[PDB]
Design a protein around this ligand. Structure first.
Ligand SMILES: COc1ccc(CO)cc1O
Ligand SMILES: COc1ccc(CO)cc1O
Lengths: 208, 208
Protein backbone atom coordinates (compact mmCIF):
# COMPACT_ATOMS: atom_id res chain seq x y z
CA UNK A 1 0.00 0.00 0.00
CA UNK A 2 1.70 3.10 -1.51
CA UNK A 3 -0.17 6.37 -1.98
CA UNK A 4 0.79 8.66 -4.90
CA UNK A 5 0.37 12.41 -4.73
CA UNK A 6 0.94 15.28 -7.10
CA UNK A 7 3.34 18.04 -6.14
CA UNK A 8 1.66 21.46 -6.03
CA UNK A 9 2.45 23.27 -9.34
CA UNK A 10 4.88 25.66 -7.67
CA UNK A 11 6.93 22.85 -5.97
CA UNK A 12 7.01 20.95 -9.26
CA UNK A 13 8.37 24.19 -10.90
CA UNK A 14 11.06 24.59 -8.15
CA UNK A 15 12.13 20.99 -8.70
CA UNK A 16 12.38 21.47 -12.49
CA UNK A 17 14.36 24.63 -11.97
CA UNK A 18 16.81 22.90 -9.58
CA UNK A 19 17.09 19.96 -12.05
CA UNK A 20 17.48 22.00 -15.20
CA UNK A 21 19.41 25.19 -14.43
CA UNK A 22 23.13 25.00 -15.23
CA UNK A 23 24.70 25.62 -11.81
CA UNK A 24 28.06 24.27 -10.76
CA UNK A 25 28.09 24.90 -7.01
CA UNK A 26 26.06 21.73 -6.27
CA UNK A 27 27.89 21.04 -2.96
CA UNK A 28 25.54 23.35 -1.07
CA UNK A 29 22.96 20.51 -0.93
CA UNK A 30 24.70 19.04 2.13
CA UNK A 31 24.68 22.30 4.01
CA UNK A 32 20.95 22.59 3.41
CA UNK A 33 20.17 19.05 4.59
CA UNK A 34 22.34 19.47 7.72
CA UNK A 35 20.55 22.80 8.51
CA UNK A 36 17.21 21.09 8.24
CA UNK A 37 18.57 18.40 10.57
CA UNK A 38 19.87 21.05 13.05
CA UNK A 39 16.43 22.81 13.05
CA UNK A 40 14.63 19.56 13.76
CA UNK A 41 17.11 18.68 16.62
CA UNK A 42 16.44 22.16 18.12
CA UNK A 43 12.68 21.43 18.06
CA UNK A 44 12.85 18.14 19.94
CA UNK A 45 15.35 19.74 22.40
CA UNK A 46 12.84 22.62 22.96
CA UNK A 47 9.97 20.27 23.57
CA UNK A 48 12.04 18.25 26.02
CA UNK A 49 12.73 21.36 28.16
CA UNK A 50 9.21 21.07 29.48
CA UNK A 51 8.40 17.40 28.82
CA UNK A 52 11.43 15.16 29.23
CA UNK A 53 9.50 12.05 28.02
CA UNK A 54 9.76 13.42 24.43
CA UNK A 55 13.25 12.01 24.59
CA UNK A 56 12.06 8.52 25.48
CA UNK A 57 12.41 7.66 21.75
CA UNK A 58 16.16 8.42 22.02
CA UNK A 59 18.10 10.92 24.19
CA UNK A 60 21.05 11.38 21.81
CA UNK A 61 20.74 14.41 19.48
CA UNK A 62 23.01 14.06 16.49
CA UNK A 63 23.59 13.86 12.73
CA UNK A 64 25.10 10.96 10.78
CA UNK A 65 26.51 11.07 7.29
CA UNK A 66 26.50 7.62 5.69
CA UNK A 67 28.02 7.10 2.21
CA UNK A 68 27.58 3.79 0.42
CA UNK A 69 29.42 3.37 -2.88
CA UNK A 70 27.78 0.13 -3.62
CA UNK A 71 24.25 1.50 -3.50
CA UNK A 72 25.39 4.96 -4.71
CA UNK A 73 23.64 6.62 -1.77
CA UNK A 74 24.51 9.34 0.65
CA UNK A 75 22.32 9.16 3.80
CA UNK A 76 21.79 12.11 6.21
CA UNK A 77 20.31 10.82 9.51
CA UNK A 78 19.12 13.04 12.37
CA UNK A 79 17.44 12.25 15.68
CA UNK A 80 15.34 15.41 15.44
CA UNK A 81 11.62 15.92 15.92
CA UNK A 82 10.58 13.96 12.81
CA UNK A 83 7.58 14.53 10.71
CA UNK A 84 3.95 13.39 10.89
CA UNK A 85 2.34 11.93 7.72
CA UNK A 86 0.60 15.28 7.33
CA UNK A 87 3.88 17.22 7.54
CA UNK A 88 5.44 14.82 5.06
CA UNK A 89 2.62 15.30 2.46
CA UNK A 90 2.44 19.05 3.13
CA UNK A 91 5.94 19.64 1.63
CA UNK A 92 8.09 18.20 4.45
CA UNK A 93 6.78 20.72 7.01
CA UNK A 94 7.72 23.71 4.87
CA UNK A 95 5.77 26.68 3.48
CA UNK A 96 7.01 25.64 0.09
CA UNK A 97 4.50 27.41 -2.19
CA UNK A 98 5.19 30.79 -0.73
CA UNK A 99 8.90 29.88 -0.30
CA UNK A 100 9.16 29.01 -4.03
CA UNK A 101 7.47 32.32 -4.86
CA UNK A 102 9.97 34.41 -2.86
CA UNK A 103 12.93 32.32 -4.22
CA UNK A 104 11.78 32.84 -7.91
CA UNK A 105 11.53 36.62 -7.52
CA UNK A 106 14.91 36.58 -5.77
CA UNK A 107 16.48 34.74 -8.68
CA UNK A 108 15.18 37.82 -10.62
CA UNK A 109 16.82 40.38 -8.28
CA UNK A 110 20.28 38.66 -8.73
CA UNK A 111 20.13 35.78 -6.31
CA UNK A 112 21.59 32.34 -7.03
CA UNK A 113 20.56 28.77 -6.18
CA UNK A 114 22.87 28.64 -3.14
CA UNK A 115 20.51 31.04 -1.39
CA UNK A 116 17.64 28.46 -1.51
CA UNK A 117 17.63 27.93 2.27
CA UNK A 118 16.82 31.61 2.92
CA UNK A 119 13.34 30.81 1.36
CA UNK A 120 12.82 27.79 3.51
CA UNK A 121 12.81 25.16 0.78
CA UNK A 122 16.46 23.93 1.01
CA UNK A 123 15.31 20.29 1.08
CA UNK A 124 14.70 20.47 -2.71
CA UNK A 125 18.44 21.18 -3.27
CA UNK A 126 18.74 17.36 -2.76
CA UNK A 127 17.81 17.36 -6.47
CA UNK A 128 21.10 19.10 -7.42
CA UNK A 129 22.78 15.76 -6.82
CA UNK A 130 20.17 12.98 -6.46
CA UNK A 131 18.03 11.38 -9.09
CA UNK A 132 15.76 9.92 -6.44
CA UNK A 133 15.27 10.98 -2.80
CA UNK A 134 13.80 8.71 -0.10
CA UNK A 135 12.82 10.31 3.24
CA UNK A 136 12.22 8.01 6.23
CA UNK A 137 10.73 9.86 9.22
CA UNK A 138 9.39 9.03 12.70
CA UNK A 139 7.62 11.59 14.87
CA UNK A 140 6.62 10.78 18.52
CA UNK A 141 2.97 11.41 17.64
CA UNK A 142 2.75 9.15 14.57
CA UNK A 143 4.09 6.03 12.74
CA UNK A 144 7.22 5.68 10.65
CA UNK A 145 6.71 6.71 7.00
CA UNK A 146 8.65 6.54 3.81
CA UNK A 147 8.38 9.45 1.28
CA UNK A 148 9.84 8.97 -2.13
CA UNK A 149 10.33 11.06 -5.31
CA UNK A 150 12.37 11.00 -8.51
CA UNK A 151 10.70 14.33 -9.31
CA UNK A 152 8.54 14.50 -12.48
CA UNK A 153 5.55 15.91 -10.58
CA UNK A 154 4.73 13.17 -8.04
CA UNK A 155 5.86 11.60 -4.75
CA UNK A 156 4.79 8.53 -2.81
CA UNK A 157 4.07 7.93 0.82
CA UNK A 158 3.98 4.47 2.50
CA UNK A 159 4.16 3.34 6.11
CA UNK A 160 7.67 2.06 6.52
CA UNK A 161 8.10 -1.37 8.16
CA UNK A 162 11.85 -1.22 7.47
CA UNK A 163 14.32 -0.69 10.33
CA UNK A 164 12.56 1.15 13.16
CA UNK A 165 14.39 4.36 13.82
CA UNK A 166 12.96 5.50 17.08
CA UNK A 167 12.75 9.23 16.22
CA UNK A 168 14.07 11.45 13.48
CA UNK A 169 14.51 11.77 9.76
CA UNK A 170 16.65 9.90 7.35
CA UNK A 171 17.31 11.47 3.85
CA UNK A 172 18.55 8.83 1.37
CA UNK A 173 20.16 10.45 -1.72
CA UNK A 174 20.30 8.09 -4.72
CA UNK A 175 23.06 10.02 -6.49
CA UNK A 176 23.27 10.80 -10.18
CA UNK A 177 25.97 8.84 -12.03
CA UNK A 178 28.17 11.96 -12.46
CA UNK A 179 27.81 13.06 -8.73
CA UNK A 180 29.66 10.32 -6.94
CA UNK A 181 32.29 12.73 -5.59
CA UNK A 182 29.78 13.13 -2.68
CA UNK A 183 30.56 9.55 -1.62
CA UNK A 184 34.25 10.39 -1.11
CA UNK A 185 35.33 10.80 2.50
CA UNK A 186 37.73 13.68 1.71
CA UNK A 187 35.09 15.64 -0.22
CA UNK A 188 32.30 15.16 2.42
CA UNK A 189 34.79 16.29 5.14
CA UNK A 190 35.74 19.34 3.14
CA UNK A 191 32.11 20.36 2.53
CA UNK A 192 31.22 19.86 6.20
CA UNK A 193 34.19 21.96 7.27
CA UNK A 194 33.44 24.72 4.68
CA UNK A 195 29.69 25.13 5.24
CA UNK A 196 28.59 23.35 8.43
CA UNK A 197 31.35 24.09 11.01
CA UNK A 198 29.21 25.84 13.65
CA UNK A 199 26.42 23.28 13.81
CA UNK A 200 25.63 22.59 17.42
CA UNK A 201 25.21 18.81 17.30
CA UNK A 202 27.82 16.12 16.57
CA UNK A 203 28.08 15.21 12.93
CA UNK A 204 29.60 11.79 12.41
CA UNK A 205 30.92 10.85 9.00
CA UNK A 206 30.75 7.07 8.59
CA UNK A 207 33.45 5.19 6.85
CA UNK A 208 33.26 2.28 4.38
CA UNK B 1 0.74 41.93 39.36
CA UNK B 2 4.28 41.55 37.87
CA UNK B 3 6.27 38.35 38.27
CA UNK B 4 10.09 38.55 38.44
CA UNK B 5 12.31 35.74 37.24
CA UNK B 6 16.02 35.10 37.15
CA UNK B 7 17.72 34.48 33.84
CA UNK B 8 19.45 31.08 33.70
CA UNK B 9 23.20 31.64 34.41
CA UNK B 10 24.17 31.02 30.78
CA UNK B 11 21.63 33.57 29.36
CA UNK B 12 22.77 36.11 31.95
CA UNK B 13 26.39 35.47 30.73
CA UNK B 14 25.35 35.93 27.03
CA UNK B 15 23.66 39.21 27.94
CA UNK B 16 26.75 40.47 29.81
CA UNK B 17 28.94 39.48 26.90
CA UNK B 18 26.71 41.32 24.39
CA UNK B 19 26.63 44.37 26.74
CA UNK B 20 30.32 44.45 27.55
CA UNK B 21 32.32 43.32 24.52
CA UNK B 22 33.70 46.16 22.39
CA UNK B 23 32.04 45.50 19.03
CA UNK B 24 31.25 48.18 16.50
CA UNK B 25 28.98 46.39 14.04
CA UNK B 26 25.88 46.88 16.25
CA UNK B 27 23.51 47.29 13.24
CA UNK B 28 23.07 43.53 12.95
CA UNK B 29 20.48 43.67 15.79
CA UNK B 30 17.76 44.64 13.29
CA UNK B 31 18.53 41.76 10.97
CA UNK B 32 18.22 39.37 13.89
CA UNK B 33 14.88 40.76 15.08
CA UNK B 34 13.45 40.72 11.53
CA UNK B 35 14.60 37.06 11.10
CA UNK B 36 12.85 36.12 14.30
CA UNK B 37 9.76 37.91 12.95
CA UNK B 38 10.04 36.08 9.57
CA UNK B 39 10.33 32.68 11.38
CA UNK B 40 7.26 33.38 13.47
CA UNK B 41 5.25 34.51 10.34
CA UNK B 42 6.27 31.22 8.63
CA UNK B 43 4.91 29.28 11.64
CA UNK B 44 1.45 30.85 11.64
CA UNK B 45 1.35 30.51 7.80
CA UNK B 46 2.20 26.76 8.19
CA UNK B 47 -0.48 26.21 10.77
CA UNK B 48 -3.04 27.98 8.60
CA UNK B 49 -2.37 25.58 5.69
CA UNK B 50 -4.38 22.98 7.54
CA UNK B 51 -6.51 25.12 9.88
CA UNK B 52 -7.50 28.43 8.30
CA UNK B 53 -9.14 29.68 11.56
CA UNK B 54 -5.61 30.28 12.97
CA UNK B 55 -5.77 33.43 10.91
CA UNK B 56 -8.98 34.62 12.54
CA UNK B 57 -6.78 36.82 14.80
CA UNK B 58 -5.54 38.65 11.68
CA UNK B 59 -4.98 37.45 8.07
CA UNK B 60 -2.24 39.96 7.18
CA UNK B 61 1.32 38.63 7.64
CA UNK B 62 3.80 41.46 7.92
CA UNK B 63 6.51 43.37 9.78
CA UNK B 64 6.40 47.00 10.92
CA UNK B 65 9.32 49.15 11.93
CA UNK B 66 8.23 52.02 14.17
CA UNK B 67 10.75 54.65 15.32
CA UNK B 68 9.78 57.22 17.93
CA UNK B 69 12.33 59.93 18.70
CA UNK B 70 10.34 61.29 21.53
CA UNK B 71 10.27 58.02 23.48
CA UNK B 72 13.67 56.94 22.07
CA UNK B 73 12.21 53.61 20.98
CA UNK B 74 12.46 51.47 17.92
CA UNK B 75 9.54 48.98 17.70
CA UNK B 76 9.60 45.80 15.56
CA UNK B 77 6.03 44.45 15.16
CA UNK B 78 5.13 41.14 13.50
CA UNK B 79 1.82 39.33 13.05
CA UNK B 80 3.52 35.96 13.52
CA UNK B 81 2.59 33.02 15.71
CA UNK B 82 3.28 34.80 19.03
CA UNK B 83 4.41 33.26 22.19
CA UNK B 84 2.64 31.58 25.12
CA UNK B 85 3.56 32.68 28.69
CA UNK B 86 5.59 29.48 28.91
CA UNK B 87 7.52 30.26 25.71
CA UNK B 88 8.12 33.79 26.95
CA UNK B 89 9.59 32.61 30.31
CA UNK B 90 11.51 29.76 28.65
CA UNK B 91 13.84 32.21 26.81
CA UNK B 92 11.42 33.51 24.14
CA UNK B 93 10.89 30.03 22.63
CA UNK B 94 14.61 29.47 22.10
CA UNK B 95 17.06 26.76 23.21
CA UNK B 96 19.12 29.51 24.70
CA UNK B 97 21.27 27.57 27.18
CA UNK B 98 22.60 25.24 24.56
CA UNK B 99 22.62 28.10 21.99
CA UNK B 100 24.80 30.23 24.32
CA UNK B 101 27.13 27.25 24.79
CA UNK B 102 27.68 26.75 21.04
CA UNK B 103 28.03 30.57 20.50
CA UNK B 104 30.73 30.86 23.29
CA UNK B 105 32.85 28.05 21.84
CA UNK B 106 32.41 29.63 18.40
CA UNK B 107 33.69 32.95 19.67
CA UNK B 108 36.76 30.80 20.59
CA UNK B 109 37.16 29.30 17.09
CA UNK B 110 37.23 32.85 15.51
CA UNK B 111 33.57 33.75 15.27
CA UNK B 112 32.22 37.24 15.93
CA UNK B 113 29.02 38.62 17.50
CA UNK B 114 27.34 39.07 14.11
CA UNK B 115 27.05 35.30 13.88
CA UNK B 116 24.75 35.18 16.96
CA UNK B 117 21.69 34.11 14.95
CA UNK B 118 23.42 30.91 13.78
CA UNK B 119 23.15 29.75 17.48
CA UNK B 120 19.51 30.60 17.72
CA UNK B 121 19.76 33.35 20.32
CA UNK B 122 19.70 36.46 18.02
CA UNK B 123 16.99 38.09 20.17
CA UNK B 124 19.68 38.99 22.76
CA UNK B 125 21.47 41.16 20.15
CA UNK B 126 18.69 43.69 21.06
CA UNK B 127 21.13 44.47 23.91
CA UNK B 128 23.75 45.83 21.46
CA UNK B 129 21.57 48.89 21.16
CA UNK B 130 18.85 48.90 23.85
CA UNK B 131 19.17 49.55 27.53
CA UNK B 132 15.75 48.04 28.15
CA UNK B 133 13.70 45.66 25.96
CA UNK B 134 9.92 45.20 26.27
CA UNK B 135 8.32 42.25 24.41
CA UNK B 136 4.54 42.26 23.95
CA UNK B 137 3.22 38.95 22.56
CA UNK B 138 -0.15 37.33 21.78
CA UNK B 139 -0.47 33.68 20.82
CA UNK B 140 -3.87 32.19 19.69
CA UNK B 141 -3.73 29.73 22.59
CA UNK B 142 -3.06 32.22 25.40
CA UNK B 143 -3.45 35.85 26.68
CA UNK B 144 -1.40 38.89 25.80
CA UNK B 145 1.76 39.25 27.93
CA UNK B 146 4.42 41.81 28.47
CA UNK B 147 8.06 40.66 29.07
CA UNK B 148 10.56 43.20 30.21
CA UNK B 149 14.32 43.33 30.95
CA UNK B 150 17.08 45.89 31.39
CA UNK B 151 19.41 42.90 31.81
CA UNK B 152 21.26 42.57 35.16
CA UNK B 153 20.07 38.98 35.66
CA UNK B 154 16.26 39.31 35.77
CA UNK B 155 13.16 39.85 33.62
CA UNK B 156 9.50 40.46 34.39
CA UNK B 157 6.33 39.03 33.00
CA UNK B 158 2.86 40.63 33.37
CA UNK B 159 -0.43 40.14 31.54
CA UNK B 160 -0.68 43.12 29.26
CA UNK B 161 -3.98 45.05 29.27
CA UNK B 162 -2.46 47.65 26.93
CA UNK B 163 -3.55 47.84 23.28
CA UNK B 164 -4.82 44.42 22.19
CA UNK B 165 -2.75 43.25 19.29
CA UNK B 166 -4.70 40.35 17.97
CA UNK B 167 -1.71 38.06 17.23
CA UNK B 168 2.03 38.49 17.06
CA UNK B 169 5.02 39.95 18.82
CA UNK B 170 6.07 43.48 19.40
CA UNK B 171 9.76 44.18 20.39
CA UNK B 172 10.12 47.66 21.96
CA UNK B 173 13.80 48.79 22.01
CA UNK B 174 14.45 51.56 24.57
CA UNK B 175 17.67 52.75 22.90
CA UNK B 176 20.87 53.75 24.63
CA UNK B 177 21.59 57.49 24.52
CA UNK B 178 24.48 57.02 22.03
CA UNK B 179 22.43 54.67 19.68
CA UNK B 180 19.82 57.01 18.32
CA UNK B 181 21.08 56.63 14.74
CA UNK B 182 18.63 53.64 14.68
CA UNK B 183 15.74 56.12 14.84
CA UNK B 184 16.83 57.78 11.57
CA UNK B 185 14.78 56.86 8.52
CA UNK B 186 17.81 56.82 6.19
CA UNK B 187 19.82 54.52 8.49
CA UNK B 188 16.92 52.03 9.12
CA UNK B 189 16.32 51.89 5.31
CA UNK B 190 19.98 51.24 4.66
CA UNK B 191 20.19 48.44 7.24
CA UNK B 192 17.01 46.81 5.91
CA UNK B 193 18.34 46.96 2.36
CA UNK B 194 21.81 45.62 3.39
CA UNK B 195 20.74 42.69 5.60
CA UNK B 196 17.02 41.96 5.18
CA UNK B 197 16.34 42.31 1.41
CA UNK B 198 15.05 38.77 0.73
CA UNK B 199 12.57 38.58 3.60
CA UNK B 200 9.34 37.17 2.30
CA UNK B 201 6.86 39.45 4.07
CA UNK B 202 6.28 43.20 3.64
CA UNK B 203 8.37 45.33 5.94
CA UNK B 204 6.89 48.77 6.43
CA UNK B 205 9.06 51.53 7.84
CA UNK B 206 6.85 54.07 9.62
CA UNK B 207 7.54 57.71 9.41
CA UNK B 208 7.37 60.43 12.09
C1 LIG C 1 11.58 18.22 10.70
O1 LIG C 1 12.66 17.36 10.35
C2 LIG C 1 13.15 17.38 9.12
C3 LIG C 1 12.38 17.85 8.06
C4 LIG C 1 12.90 17.88 6.77
C5 LIG C 1 14.20 17.43 6.54
C6 LIG C 1 14.72 17.46 5.24
O2 LIG C 1 16.13 17.54 5.05
C7 LIG C 1 14.97 16.96 7.59
C8 LIG C 1 14.45 16.94 8.88
O3 LIG C 1 15.15 16.52 9.83
C1 LIG D 1 7.82 33.43 17.96
O1 LIG D 1 7.78 34.83 17.71
C2 LIG D 1 8.80 35.60 18.07
C3 LIG D 1 9.67 35.18 19.07
C4 LIG D 1 10.74 35.98 19.45
C5 LIG D 1 10.94 37.21 18.82
C6 LIG D 1 12.02 38.02 19.20
O2 LIG D 1 12.56 38.95 18.28
C7 LIG D 1 10.07 37.63 17.82
C8 LIG D 1 9.00 36.82 17.44
O3 LIG D 1 8.22 37.20 16.54
Amino acid sequence: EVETFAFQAEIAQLMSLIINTFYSNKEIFLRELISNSSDALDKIRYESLTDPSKLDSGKELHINLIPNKQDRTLTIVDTGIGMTKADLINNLGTIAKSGTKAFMEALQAGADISMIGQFGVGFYSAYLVAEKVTVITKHNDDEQYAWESSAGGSFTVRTDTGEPMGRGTKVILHLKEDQTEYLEERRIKEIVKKHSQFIGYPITLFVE
